[PDB]
Design goal:
Blueprint: E1 3-9, E2 17-23, E3 28-35, E4 41-43, E5 68-78, E6 84-96, E7 99-112, H1 114-117, E8 124-127, H2 144-148, E9 156-160, E10 167-171, E11 184-187, E12 196-204, E13 210-218, E14 225-227, H3 229-236, E15 243-245, E16 250-254, E17 262-266, E18 269-273, E19 279-282, E20 289-292, E21 294-296, E22 303-305, H4 307-310, E23 314-318, E24 324-328
Parallel strand pairs: 3-8, 4-7, 13-22, 14-21
Antiparallel strand pairs: 1-2, 1-10, 2-3, 2-6, 4-8, 5-6, 6-7, 9-10, 9-23, 11-24, 12-13, 12-17, 14-22, 15-16, 16-20, 17-18, 19-20, 23-24
The structure holds (1R,2S,3R,4R)-3-amino-4-cyclohexylcyclopentane-1,2-diol.
Residues 15, 223-224, 280, 283, 291 line the site of (1R,2S,3R,4R)-3-amino-4-cyclohexylcyclopentane-1,2-diol (D8A).
PDB class: hydrolase
Keywords: Hydrolase
Assembly: monomeric
């Protein structure tokens, strides 16, 4: 089997991407944030504290003839940005772009933090990291991909995020028309439950490539590119007036600036992030200070190849017995 679904930026900045997902019978379609950095499929629901729902589409398990309460199961997750959610668990039928999984754990939110409430465009998350990170207790549950894998033509999914444009998540096949040149594959460590890999280095604009190992995770659920302070300083040094602002919470730059590209290495291959991908707009409405798309990972504990990096590439998440990651230009 295969699946193919369009993923769409939630706003003009590509802050996140949502993908339609069919849950239950008859289908209830929710727009989920596909997150290769987490492993829970959770949704706004009929059970979510009413005051914490503001415009989201909700899953109503009582209206699904295939919904079954997973007795005694609870979940609770907190993400890297300080947001959180929790609730109970159903199993139900879940389909993404024509690919169907029966008995998928659908985690129903009873509580969500303010940042989820305040974002009307995201109805929940669909985790695509390794199932070892799943927070369901006392019986850990598998991700959608983990459940689908054996049925897929090939045990892979691909992320093809657009810049200011829709893109595609494919399951079970590699669309050879969706990228240029070749796909370069690179080793993955699953030790921390992430799609963790090691970049071979970087360049800033037309500058010389610096060969240096950068361990990080491929995370579709993170907006920005988070890299070591040395690398990030080298980047913003090429932008007149750019500086790190403690009050804003990262590097900012004059909105009048022309940003240089950023290149990262995948083995001997190179992925080039165009400068305008790195512009995340005025720090507040009307401001002439803009927020940078490359930020320091220093206070995180891990480097994160988020959407800013990933949307410059066609990315293969290879879920073979020994998982690997593939990157191609496009
Ligand atoms: N909505 C945020 C995304 O998640 C990125 O982290 C940056 C963006 C925003 C830009 C304006 C300054 C504050 C941060």
């Amino acid at each position: 089997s295969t699946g193919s679904a369009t993923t769409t930026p939630i706003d003009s900045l590509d802050d996140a991407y949502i993908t339609p997902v069919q849950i239950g019978t008859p289908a209830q379609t929710l727009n989920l944030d596909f997150d290769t950095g987490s492993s829970d499929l959770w949704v706004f629901s009929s059970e979510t504290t009413a005051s914490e729902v503001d415009g989201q589409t909700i899953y109503t398990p009582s209206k699904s003839t295939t919904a079954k309460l997973l007795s005694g199961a609870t979940w609770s997750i907190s993400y890297g940005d300080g947001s959180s959610s929790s609730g109970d668990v159903y199993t139900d039928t879940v389909s993404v772009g024509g690919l169907t999984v029966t008995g998928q754990a659908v985690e129903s939110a009873k509580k969500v933090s303010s940042s989820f409430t305040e974002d009307s465009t995201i109805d929940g998350l669909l985790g695509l990291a390794f199932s070892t990170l799943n927070t369901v207790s006392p019986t850990q549950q598998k991700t959608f991909f983990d459940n689908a894998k054996a049925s897929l033509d090939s045990p892979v999914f691909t992320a093809d995020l657009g810049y200011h444009a829709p893109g595609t998540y494919n399951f079970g096949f590699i669309d050879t028309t969706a990228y240029t040149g070749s796909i370069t594959y690179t080793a993955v460590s699953t030790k921390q439950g992430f799609w963790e890999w090691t970049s071979t280095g970087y360049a800033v604009g037309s500058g010389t490539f610096k060969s240096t190992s950068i361990d990080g995770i491929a995370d579709t659920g993170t907006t920005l590119l988070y890299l070591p302070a040395t690398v990030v300083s080298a980047y913003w040094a090429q932008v007149s007036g750019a500086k790190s602002s403690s009050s804003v919470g990262g590097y900012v730059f004059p909105c009048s600036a022309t940003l240089p590209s950023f290149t990262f290495g995948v083995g001997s291959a190179r992925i080039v992030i165009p400068g305008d991908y790195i512009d995340f707009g005025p720090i507040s409405t009307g401001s002439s200070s803009c927020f940078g798309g490359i930020q320091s990972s220093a206070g995180i504990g891990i480097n994160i190849f988020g959407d800013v990096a990933l949307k410059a590439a066609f990315v293969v998440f290879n879920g073979a017995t020994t998982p690997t990651l593939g990157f191609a230009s496009k």
